[PDB]
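Consortium newsletter contribution from the modelling node. Members have asked for a concrete example of what our holo predictions look like. Here is one, prepared for the zinc ion complex that several groups have been discussing at recent meetings.
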Amino acid sequence: VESYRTMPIYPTYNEVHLDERPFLRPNIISGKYDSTAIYLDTHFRLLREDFVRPLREGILELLQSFEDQGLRKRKFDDIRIYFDTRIITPMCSSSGIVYKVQFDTKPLKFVRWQNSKRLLYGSLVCMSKDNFETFLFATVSNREQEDLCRGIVQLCFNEQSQQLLAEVQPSDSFLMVETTAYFEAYRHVLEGLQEVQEEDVPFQRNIVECNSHVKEPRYLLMGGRYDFTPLIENHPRINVLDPGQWPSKEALKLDDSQMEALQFALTRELAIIQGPPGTGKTYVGLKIVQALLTNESVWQISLQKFPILVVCYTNHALDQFLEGIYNCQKTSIVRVGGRSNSEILKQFTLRELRNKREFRRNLPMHLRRAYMSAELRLQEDLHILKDAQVVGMTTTGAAKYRQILQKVEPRIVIVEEAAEVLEAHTIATLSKACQHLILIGDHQQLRPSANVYDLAKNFNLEVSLFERLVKVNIPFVRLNYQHRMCPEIARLLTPHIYQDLENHPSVLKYEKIKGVSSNLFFVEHNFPEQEIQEGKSHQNQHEAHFVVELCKYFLCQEYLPSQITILTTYTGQLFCLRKLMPAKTFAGVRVHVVDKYQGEENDIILLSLVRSNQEGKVGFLQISNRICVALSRAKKGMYCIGNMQMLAKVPLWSKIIHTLRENNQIGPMLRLCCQNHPETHTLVSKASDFQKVPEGGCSLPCEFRLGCGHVCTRACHPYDSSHKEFQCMKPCQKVICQEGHRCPLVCFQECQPCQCS
Ligand SMILES: [Zn+2]
Ligand SMILES: [Zn+2]
Ligand SMILES: [Zn+2]
Ligand SMILES: [Zn+2]
Ligand SMILES: [Zn+2]
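And here is the predicted structure:
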């Protein structure tokens, strides 16, 4: 039996040309694993197949389609083709031997390289000149925008293919195939996962054995008392194992559930923090890291410093988390990865720490002498991290630098948004020295996506580590109290999704949105959807027009564009909205899809469900998680549209619709209100129904007496009630000369000399 380590990461000749089914095991999410060995085997096999199966199926489709003449024009969903690609010259690089390779640019004139995801740094690319009898596995090494326009890329061949490089003539033409999937998120994790020894995976007795017993961290057995003064002030030392000695929640500026979560995460080596959207998890993260850093003496046992390691999945979450801790800690924060957009954290990037004359001065003499005489770029990182307290990387970064983290041996590991990281990713970051792992996230929301649906559904690949530990009944704490949504919105989540979720008293203060009788309304309609030729998405013209017109109407209510955002569930509808989106009138209005809008919040969200057809083809709106995400994004304004009749077949949607029908907030038409004339209510159901309120007021004329003596030619409008920025279009008529001639200009224009003067 071949160990998972000996299994080649790349696909083999056999895997593609003959139809072998590799042995795979679905995850046992309802029971324990027989061994950690088979545990790692299963995870590696699943992730490997996840990455390669699209590639092998695409190669099969291509070889079966070679006999067809329409190859250049055919779009392959999972692979990309570059024609007449020849290998031109070698070059010497700091990372080894690279080869310039040029492809044809005639079919790729439409490609705008500055935004394209094609052939990015680190992508798999496969060569062949004999209809894929032989493969040259390759990785994109260095790309330039001007160079991509001319069709050349730098490629770093692997160890096997470099042997086949010895005989390639430059005249040879190779067929370029790139996987759509982002290699490095798989490549680094796979390499680390093979490198992972069965013994060095920590918490074997909990992760694999599935025991509900989680002890305190090992470093509490030697004794340690905590001082909570910096958290209170922004005090006698306190034994954290005793609940009765803790400080007050008001001093720490936390509620009861947040205090319980803090104490649990601080006292339990593997504590899991659940939190509904809007409750507040980042604040608790800052509090726990502050408490841990204040009390270094408790956990640091040796003279050598072991920093806190903080790993996330997205850069922006990491940047906001490090900005948060910067409120309480103003030094010794180090961040790796150059894709940070946060200027405050720019000064702490690894490159900048490598800079500064003082660092070049205080470097060891032996290190400096070697410099004059990849080794000098190492041993630089180690000294910096030994002087820090917190480190931030993405999971891909943690896998990439796993050797350095093996060296440093961080004892504190914090993974934000644990529900959005693959379990295989979390295996790569855990090391042997991990004595404390904390997970914050929400399994009720979305979970990481698999490239293939079969592994996603029948193999449970999407089950995050967070979700698996929740399902195997490892104890966890549930954050309570919501701070974001108003009570009317909150009633949609309770009790149909969350059994117990109370409203923080701050939410009862939310004011009514102006110009509409209801702060939450669902528009029901039966207009069928329109399919798109390309892709599997769907779009609705009626919903798009209605939503964009309501968007325009709300701008007339003095609501700034930044407080308004349009959410849609499908990409085709998003492309439809931007068509109805001239930047002149709604600049600053963000249009995103629900999946890409996880974690963002806004004042008003207009949601378009799109799906409406007689056959009952719901799509993926039938899943509970995505619904829990889509319907809880705004603070004060919910305005939705979608077919209630079909959606009633999903039990969750039918409960939601029943709750809506209870409060009369659902109907075929939306009731509107004129601010200047509260007595009139206008019913809107279609795009043409917005002609009655062109400025957002009422169809009656403005009738306001301007300071120039004329009357406002606009109709009723609530914006600029003083008419200070209004310009009179009526004639001026003002006498401007002694002869009695009247000014021919417009009234708002300044009078010019008589054209007599
Ligand atoms: Zn009016
Ligand atoms: Zn007016
Ligand atoms: Zn005039
Ligand atoms: Zn006038
Ligand atoms: Zn005159």
